[PDB]
């Protein structure tokens, strides 16, 4: 059997988030906290739609990962080590599917990978420029006004 922890984050009412971003208002949403297994780490994803006017990163989807205090923390090694695959799923025809993803190795020297002293680690690890919003107009990433984000963790 396989052993990686995988979470599928469904972000509904996406059109509403886009309108908000275009109105130059912050758009920050988090996935529910999820476990990489049992025992496993409790993590959550953070998605930001950068403002149309953000200079370093205008009109980008930012995607980060945060460690959280989990119920199995006493039975896990720390700091966290492993790889995390972040993917925005193509929901078009299966004939040929091109997901948009990045794979990142954890860096144990960063406090983002230690256990937080509060529910959610203030420090997160990820990509400010994960995917440009214009990319959503090139493939059916949005279906039934929903975006699908996948997170696979390999410890």
């Amino acid at each position: 059997q396989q052993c990686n922890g995988i979470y599928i984050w469904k972000i509904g009412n996406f059109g509403m988030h886009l309108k908000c971003q275009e109105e130059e208002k912050p758009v920050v949403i988090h996935s529910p906290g999820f476990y990489t297994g049992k025992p496993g780490y409790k993590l959550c994803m953070r998605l930001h739609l950068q403002l149309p006017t953000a200079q370093r990163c205008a009109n980008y989807i930012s995607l980060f990962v945060h460690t959280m205090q989990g119920e199995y923390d006493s039975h896990l090694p720390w700091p966290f080590q492993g790889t995390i695959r972040l993917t925005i799923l193509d929901q078009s025809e299966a004939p040929v599917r091109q997901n948009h993803e990045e794979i990142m190795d954890a860096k144990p020297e960063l406090l983002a990978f230690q256990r937080p002293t509060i529910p959610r680690n203030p420090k997160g690890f990820g990509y400010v420029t994960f995917m440009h919003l214009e990319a959503l107009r090139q493939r059916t990433f949005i279906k039934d006004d929903t975006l699908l984000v996948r997170c696979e963790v390999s410890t």
Binding site: R46, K107, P122, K123, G124, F125, G126, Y127
Partner: peptide, 9 residues
Amino acid sequence: KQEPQEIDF
């Protein structure tokens, strides 16, 4: 290759 980074929110 795009490289991830740590951000303190």
